[PDB]
Design a protein around this ligand. Structure first.
Ligand SMILES: [Fe+3]
Length: 54
């Protein structure tokens, strides 16, 4: 699983942490996050994220 970075703020989604306060368990792939999830810092949608290539 890849990290996905917000394109408009510094937030980085890390699958290992998930986003449990917003319902996303640890170990959740970015593609499986619910469609209405948003960036916890700037509130934009998943369509504004990019894969962090390795
Ligand atoms: Fe953001």
């Amino acid at each position: 699983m890849k990290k996905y970075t917000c394109t408009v703020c510094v937030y980085i989604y890390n699958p290992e942490d998930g986003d449990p306060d917003n319902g996303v368990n640890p170990g959740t792939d970015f593609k499986d996050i619910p469609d209405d999830w948003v960036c916890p810092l700037c509130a934009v949608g998943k369509d504004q994220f990019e894969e962090v290539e390795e």
